[PDB]
């Protein structure tokens, strides 16, 4: 199970290095909670901005059915509204930033996870080639052994048919000598 | 597909030794047939013997119910019967040598075909072990790569921590101010 090859060690070393001073200073669950707190905090800030923008617009609209008398008011309000669209715009960027961040840390846990799996899978395949190469050799030796048992069988066959091949006609005549002695008596 | 290792080579040579010197472009089946031909020849011969045993066991009981002095001309026929029964044995032996012969050539064929398959299996298995090793390397590299991806995100994440913790109070305050401006108009 231990990693052996230079590459297996090189991965193991990288994984254990994340594990034993990064993910033991600051673990994944507690990094995810970290961000989700501020993500929530920024959503309340958005909510509040949207509330005041709406109040700005609703006041401006009302004042606008009397725009001569409300010119100043309408101007402060127009300007004020335009300022908050800018605030909204910079807030969006930050909310984007915190979204990426939340993804990045969920990528990390993903990648880290997969990495551990990918190394387990590599060591297991190493052992599969080791077993396969070992079985090759043994196949090559069994093959040699079969060829020898084949040889030893072929020699046994060779020598067992000699007597029978050699005494056949000696026996054919030994019969059919004594046939003609049945003929005549 | 060609024998490379010393042990693949050594099995190659033991198979080809039989092909070249013992077998010589005459299948196992040919050797079987030749054994079968002589078992049939002996089959026939044992019939013939059995057949003229019967015929002695007549002219020894037949032509022996009118026998001009039975005791003497008995021996000659029992001598043959006995002289042609011991053979009936030597014959059974030879028939058995031929069956043992036929069984040997059966086992030869089994081991021979197995030598060939075992040898093909080993070459194939050897190549399989190297592909498995290629895949083990690819898998072990992808592990490093994944470990470095994970790093990249943890670095990237870490460099987004501070901008928002700083900027956020200032935004809270710009917001406080906006609603201050708006209340004030309403006076």
Question: Computed from CA positions of residues B65, B70, B76, B78, in that sequence, does the dihedral angle turn out positive or negative?
Answer: positive
Within 8 A by CB and 6+ apart from B6, the residues are: none
CA atoms within 13 A on the CB side of A111: 23
Helices B72-83, B28-59: inter-axial angle, 10-degree rounding? 170
Query: Using CB atoms, which residue from A126, A137, A175 is nearest to B49?
Result: A175
Report, in this order, helix, strand and coil percent for chain B, each rounded to 5: 85, 0, 15
Assess contact for B98 and B119: CB atoms under 8 A.
no
Chain A residues whose CB is inside 8 A of the B157 CB are: 31, 35, 101, 104-105, 108
Helix, coil or strand: residue A2: coil
Chain A residues whose CB is inside 8 A of the B163 CB are: 94, 97
Query: Using CB atoms, which residue from B63, B80, B147 is nearest to A178?
Result: B80
Write out the two tokens for A137.
Answer: 């050799």
- Could B168 and A45 be called an inter-chain contact, meaning their C-beta atoms sit closer than 8 Å? yes
- Could A122 and B104 be called an inter-chain contact, meaning their C-beta atoms sit closer than 8 Å? no
> Which residue has 């909510």 as its token pair?
A47
User: What is the distance between the alpha carbons of residues A52 and B179, in angstroms, rounded to a whole number?
Assistant: 6
Q: How many CB atoms lie within 10 A of CB A58?
A: 10
DSSP for B54-112 reads HHHHHHTTTTSSS-TTTTHHHHHHHHHHHHTTHHHHHHHHHHHHHHHHHHHHHHHHHHH
Write out the two tokens for B43.
Answer: 């089959």
Q: How many residues does chain B have?
A: 187
Assess contact for A145 and B13: CB atoms under 8 A.
no
**Nearest Cα residue to A108 out of B40, B153, B122:** B153
Q: What is the resolution of this structure in A?
A: 2.7
Helix, coil or strand: residue B5: coil
> Which residue has 């939340």 as its token pair?
A102
User: What is the distance between the alpha carbons of residues A64 and B148, in angstroms, rounded to a whole number?
Assistant: 59
Nearest CA in chain A to B13: A144
Write out the two tokens for B6.
Answer: 């010393």
Helix, coil or strand: residue A184: coil
Assess contact for B163 and A94: CB atoms under 8 A.
yes
For residue A44, the distance in angstroms to the closest alpha carbon of chain B comes to 10
Q: What are the C-alpha distances in Å from A152 to residues A49, A149, B12, B17, B106?
A: 97, 5, 17, 13, 12
Burial profile B84-109: b = 16 or more Cβ within 10 angstroms, e = fewer? beebeeebeebbebbeebbebbbbbb
Chain B residues whose CB is inside 8 A of the A15 CB are: 143, 147
- Could B122 and A140 be called an inter-chain contact, meaning their C-beta atoms sit closer than 8 Å? yes
Assess contact for A138 and B119: CB atoms under 8 A.
no
- Could B7 and A174 be called an inter-chain contact, meaning their C-beta atoms sit closer than 8 Å? no
User: What is the distance between the alpha carbons of residues B5 and B10, in angstroms, rounded to a whole number?
Assistant: 8
Write out the two tokens for B103.
Answer: 């069984």
User: What is the distance between the alpha carbons of residues B115 and A142, in angstroms, rounded to a whole number?
Assistant: 7
> Which residue has 């052996």 as its token pair?
A4
User: What is the distance between the alpha carbons of residues A117 and A158, in angstroms, rounded to a whole number?
Assistant: 60
Q: What are the C-alpha distances in Å from A21 to residues A18, A25, A182?
A: 6, 6, 110
Chain A residues whose CB is inside 8 A of the B66 CB are: none
CA atoms within 13 A on the CB side of B98: 23
User: What is the distance between the alpha carbons of residues A178 and A172, in angstroms, rounded to a whole number?
Assistant: 10
- Could A139 and B125 be called an inter-chain contact, meaning their C-beta atoms sit closer than 8 Å? yes
Residue among B142, B154, B163 with most chain A CBs within 10 A, to mutate? B154
The experimental technique behind this entry is: X-ray
- DSSP 8-state code for residue A27: -
Q: How many CB atoms lie within 10 A of CB A6?
A: 8
Query: Using CB atoms, which residue from A128, A161, A174 is nearest to B98?
Result: A161
Assess contact for A37 and A138: CB atoms under 8 A.
no
Residue among B49, B88, B137, B144 with most chain A CBs within 10 A, to mutate? B144
Chain B residues whose CB is inside 8 A of the A111 CB are: 146-147, 149-150, 153
């Amino acid at each position: 199970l231990i990693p052996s090859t230079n590459e297996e060690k090189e991965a193991d070393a990288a994984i254990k290095y994340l594990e034993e001073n990064i993910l033991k200073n600051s673990k994944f669950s507690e990094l995810i909670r970290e961000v989700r707190v501020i993500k929530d905090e920024y959503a309340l800030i958005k909510a509040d901005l949207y509330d005041v923008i709406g109040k700005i617009n609703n006041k401006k609209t009302s004042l606008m059915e009397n725009p001569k008398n409300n010119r100043d008011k309408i101007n402060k309000l127009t300007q004020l509204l335009q300022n908050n669209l800018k605030i909204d715009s910079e807030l969006e960027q930050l909310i984007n930033m915190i979204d990426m961040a939340e993804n990045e840390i969920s990528s990390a846990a993903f990648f880290f996870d997969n990495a551990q799996k990918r190394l387990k899978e590599s060591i297991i395949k190493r052992l599969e080639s080791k077993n396969n190469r070992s079985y090759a050799l043994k196949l090559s030796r069994q093959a040699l052994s079969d060829a020898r048992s084949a040889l030893s069988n072929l020699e046994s066959f060779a020598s067992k048919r000699i007597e029978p091949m050699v005494r056949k006609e000696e026996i054919k005549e030994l019969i059919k000598h004594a046939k003609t002695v049945l003929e005549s008596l």
